Scaffold this active site. Sequence first.
Site, PDB file in Angstrom:
ATOM      1  N   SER A   1      77.568  24.031  24.922  1.00 25.75           N
ATOM      2  CA  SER A   1      77.938  23.164  23.809  1.00 25.75           C
ATOM      3  C   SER A   1      77.720  23.792  22.450  1.00 25.75           C
ATOM      4  O   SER A   1      78.147  23.194  21.459  1.00 25.75           O
ATOM      5  CB  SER A   1      77.165  21.843  23.858  1.00 25.75           C
TER       6      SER A   1
ATOM      7  N   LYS B   1      80.748  24.028  20.230  1.00 24.50           N
ATOM      8  CA  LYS B   1      81.315  22.917  19.470  1.00 24.50           C
ATOM      9  C   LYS B   1      81.264  23.183  17.977  1.00 24.50           C
ATOM     10  O   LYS B   1      82.096  22.658  17.224  1.00 24.50           O
ATOM     11  CB  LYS B   1      80.593  21.618  19.823  1.00 24.50           C
TER      12      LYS B   1
ATOM     13  N   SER C   1      76.815  15.950  20.921  1.00 24.97           N
ATOM     14  CA  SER C   1      77.328  16.836  21.962  1.00 24.97           C
ATOM     15  C   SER C   1      78.351  16.123  22.839  1.00 24.97           C
ATOM     16  O   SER C   1      78.455  16.382  24.037  1.00 24.97           O
ATOM     17  CB  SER C   1      76.192  17.421  22.807  1.00 24.97           C
TER      18      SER C   1
ATOM     19  N   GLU D   1      86.080  21.255  27.988  1.00 28.91           N
ATOM     20  CA  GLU D   1      84.988  20.550  28.643  1.00 28.91           C
ATOM     21  C   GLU D   1      85.504  19.869  29.906  1.00 28.91           C
ATOM     22  O   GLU D   1      86.619  19.342  29.911  1.00 28.91           O
ATOM     23  CB  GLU D   1      84.386  19.503  27.704  1.00 28.91           C
TER      24      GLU D   1
ATOM     25  N   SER E   1      73.703  23.155  26.795  1.00 29.69           N
ATOM     26  CA  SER E   1      73.104  23.303  28.107  1.00 29.69           C
ATOM     27  C   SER E   1      74.228  23.363  29.121  1.00 29.69           C
ATOM     28  O   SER E   1      75.357  22.936  28.863  1.00 29.69           O
ATOM     29  CB  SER E   1      72.118  22.173  28.422  1.00 29.69           C
TER      30      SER E   1
END
Length: 260
Positions: free
Chosen positions: A43, A46, A103, A139, A210
């Site tokens: 993440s 992002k 996230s 994702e 993570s």
Amino acid sequence: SAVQQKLAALEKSSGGRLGVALIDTADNTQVLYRGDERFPMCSTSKVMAAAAVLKQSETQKQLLNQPVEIKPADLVNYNPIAEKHVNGTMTLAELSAAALQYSDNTAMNKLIAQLGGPGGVTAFARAIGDETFRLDRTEPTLNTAIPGDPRDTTTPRAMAQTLRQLTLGHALGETQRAQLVTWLKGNTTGAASIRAGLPTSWTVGDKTGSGDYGTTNDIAVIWPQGRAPLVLVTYFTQPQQNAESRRDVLASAARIIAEG
């Protein structure tokens, strides 16, 4: 040096692979540990998607206010904010905030779509001089963190330099940079990572990440009280696919760095 011996010991005690890059903007010194090895971004990617959309808004002044549908089919595995707006809309500003501060994976996928795919996010990295960053997937599959897989990776050194440019440099316009900094400072997921190893008086803006293989990441811009800001990137990944996240390792790495 001394810090690198302690980081190596930290790494040995953890059983994983630790990547650290610190840029001290006071004298532009860098402290690197596995600074040129690739790590899965998870993440932390992002930040680049959000910044790419911010960069578009320098020309399309109203872009951040553009409403984007959230449909049930858009939802993936972790959508804490987007789930609150299914069958409604969120602006690109709200999606960028959700991606960064919570996230939210659906938010990330909408940002990627806005940029024309992962190739559009990677393009932005190249446009600001990051030749290392690569986003290959959306994702949630970008989090697979398979050992040796170059997809969706960067290096600590590259991410530190890029985060510096986005937040403290002039890769973005002034209004966009301030918005990025405000979003990062409002992160809600970082209390146990880099922040936990730093004095409570220091203001941190960070993005955690993570993924599989116990991958535990945090990238941060740090404003110490009465001192030039620092950029700290801490990547950590482990040999076992099911390994638990080790945020404490990031906190300990930050503590070791902060001792200098």
